[PDB]
């Protein structure tokens, strides 16, 4: 870390791409709750049987387990035991969000948030 470089050379300093989370104009609404697992930014979240936030996990069970019904979108990342701020309302670009496996197409990603204040849709 000490010396300069006297010799010529090139360097690709880096690249930046915007992440657009909002895809519409509902009332954006947020809440905070304890996490039960490692949650990434804009990961879709559910609440487990103990009321702690857990990343959304459809087909968790033979009766479906409460992790299987999504409840919000993480606004900042958190480790287990920490508080997670998360969105409960708003219109969100499905592409930016973190999704479970097998929840591939937008047609499925909408089905997670029909009965809800959140709605999830495509950007143009």
């Amino acid at each position: 870390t000490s010396l300069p470089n006297y010799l010529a050379g090139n360097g690709d300093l880096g690249s930046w791409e915007p992440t657009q989370i909002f895809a519409g104009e509902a009332d954006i609404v947020t809440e905070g709750g304890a996490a039960g697992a490692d949650i990434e930014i804009y990961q879709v979240i559910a609440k487990n049987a103990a009321g702690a936030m857990v990343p959304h996990d459809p087909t968790a069970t033979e009766v479906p387990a409460p992790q299987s019904v999504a409840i919000g979108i993480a606004a900042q990342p958190a480790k287990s035991g920490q508080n997670v701020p998360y969105y409960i309302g708003g219109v969100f670009n499905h592409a930016a969000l973190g999704w479970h496996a097998s929840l591939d197409t937008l047609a499925k990603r909408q089905a997670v948030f029909d009965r809800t204040n959140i709605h999830i849709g495509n950007l143009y």
Partner: protein, 50 residues
């Protein structure tokens, strides 16, 4: 003659060979900079959408 051959000097023949500037016509902009490195930011803007 005898001691030394006399001479007439006729004018010197100086060939000064040079490399004239050709490629520098596409590098007209000059930057004198003391910083360690030069940097570019290049932006693509696909405004062709309907």
């Amino acid at each position: 003659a005898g001691l030394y051959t006399t001479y007439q000097l006729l004018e010197v023949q100086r060939k000064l060979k040079t490399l004239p500037a050709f490629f520098l016509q596409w590098f007209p902009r000059q930057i004198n900079f003391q910083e360690d490195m030069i940097a570019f930011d290049k932006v693509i803007q696909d405004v062709t959408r309907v």
